[PDB]
Amino acid sequence: SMSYTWTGALITPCAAEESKLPINALSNSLLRHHNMVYATTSRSAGLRQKKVTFDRLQVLDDHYRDVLKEMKAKASTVKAKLLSVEEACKLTPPHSAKSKFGYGAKDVRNLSSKAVNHIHSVWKDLLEDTVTPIDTTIMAKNEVFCVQPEKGGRKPARLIVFPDLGVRVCEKMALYDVVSTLPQVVMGSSYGFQYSPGQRVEFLVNTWKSKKNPMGFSYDTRCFDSTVTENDIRVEESIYQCCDLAPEARQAIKSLTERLYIGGPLTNSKGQNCGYRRCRASGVLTTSCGNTLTCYLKASAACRAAKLQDCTMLVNGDDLVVICESAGTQEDAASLRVFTEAMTRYSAPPGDPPQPEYDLELITSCSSNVSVAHDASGKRVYYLTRDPTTPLARAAWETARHTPVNSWLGNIIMYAPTLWARMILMTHFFSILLAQEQLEKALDCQIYGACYSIEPLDLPQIIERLHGLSAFSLHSYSPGEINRVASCLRKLGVPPLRVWRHRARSVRARLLSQGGRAATCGKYLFNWAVKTKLKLTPIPAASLSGWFVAGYS
């Protein structure tokens, strides 16, 4: 079947959408080449439509059924329960797209008659009807990037697809528990979202260490969402049903599967119809857990198609890395050849072919990689890092134009130990946030898809729990890493690190001299700036499990 069928309708914007950096006094403090920074909008939705449209054929194997059955046996070990309306409404962000039925996000949280009444309606209907396609809306995502390395290249918007608020609350009722409990049990240590960035590194390095002759590769599957078949999504449902669920949840899961998960009509912002969907929708509840379960099953069965050795994978939605024994260069290459062939048979062809790696550091996964540095006591320390171009460009943007759900807080959080986040990010927002008396204003940001309410003055506490005190003292960064950042600074026109050194000297003083919480941030986050460093003692005001339970984008 074809991932999609399009009528003629243009995907339409509902909000005014900006695509050129909203250039600002403050925005210039950070970045200077704002013309390289842009945002995806509707205008490009069409380009995307073509790259995402094709036919999916699937030849399912014994290796595939064997793995599926093993996964059902684990999943059949799960008892999940439907979440009462109230709880369901609770999990709803006060930023969600309003219902086309009058009530918006808040009423959903306040337990309003219009809200809880419609919700009870979708539900009554979800149970009553199990075949009528359910409407979904489709839009061009607006997120910022930096123009392709090569002068030109610009990425077309991403197309999100989501049902109505009422369906969403219902998704929560019947699937939230299942979707945040079952993955870990089915996939074990391979379930990426159970790991904090720190534990993710501990597991890659360890996995790598436990291998006599280590070899690993990432697998970049092209538009994973567009390769998911109805079969995949149906195969999905049966795993969930292997759970011990209330009878009303079972009928809920069967229903949403045939009505929305499997596919359905595509309506734009202006009520018109754009085409039909037969792959995975990006805005549903099961999309994260579904892609993770599906990528795992295909990758597992695909590993058996070759590797007569010891595979170990880490799976995050569509992102996948696997570390195994080596049997030589030329042989290992042909191994990834077979692996890719099986993956394509399962309908998960690669964007970029898989390349065997022998330098753990060069294995990037989840748009990031593992690198080495040294702490206070000079002991080697492995940390999670990545090209900083996007966080930076997005960083600049969110400083020019107020964004309710930012990326910078999350980047600092998830990437605190690195050199770009420590020197560039922390330095810049503390001074900015300080200037306007915002430090104590908790901002929203998203960790693994879920959005959280984090206070920036809590950073040291958070940073220490997630990465360890070492995070406040890394210093002998790898030449590979220094050159990435340093190259990205020239490109974006960000000021030189040497300059951030002295910039940070300043902010730290203003922070210290404020006493209390502001003082701790200044001393811990910016000790790397001062010349005569002080000896950091573990932070007492700190002693984050839920954050890394499951993926929810």
UniProtKB/Swiss-Prot annotation:
Q: Which residues form the RdRp catalytic domain?
A: 214-332
Phenotypic consequence of D318 to E/H/N: Complete loss of RdRp activity
Q: Which domain of life is it from?
A: Viruses
- Phosphoserine modified-residue sites: S29, S42
Processing after translation: The N-terminus is phosphorylated by host PRK2/PKN2.
Q: Which reaction does it catalyse?
A: RNA(n) + a ribonucleoside 5'-triphosphate = RNA(n+1) + diphosphate
On cofactor binding, the record's note says: Binds 2 magnesium ion that constitute a dinuclear catalytic metal center.
Q: Where in the cell is it found?
A: Host cytoplasm; Host endoplasmic reticulum membrane
Control of this protein's activity: Activity is up-regulated by PRK2/PKN2-mediated phosphorylation.
**How is this protein positioned relative to the membrane?**
Single-pass type IV membrane protein
Essential cofactor(s): Mg(2+)
Signal peptide as annotated in the record: none
Q: Where does Mg(2+) 2 bind?
A: D220, D318, D319
What does the protein in this record do?
Answer: RNA-dependent RNA polymerase that performs primer-template recognition and RNA synthesis during viral replication. Initiates RNA transcription/replication at a flavin adenine dinucleotide (FAD), resulting in a 5'- FAD cap on viral RNAs. In this way, recognition of viral 5' RNA by host pattern recognition receptors can be bypassed, thereby evading activation of antiviral pathways.
Q: How does it assemble?
A: Homooligomer. Interacts with non-structural protein 5A. Interacts with host VAPB. Interacts with host PRK2/PKN2. Interacts with host HNRNPA1 and SEPT6; these interactions facilitate the viral replication. Part of the replication complex composed of NS2, NS3, NS4A, NS4B, NS5A and the RNA-directed RNA polymerase embedded in an ER-derived membranous web.
- Descriptive protein name: RNA-directed RNA polymerase
Q: Which organism is it from?
A: Hepatitis C virus genotype 1b (isolate BK)
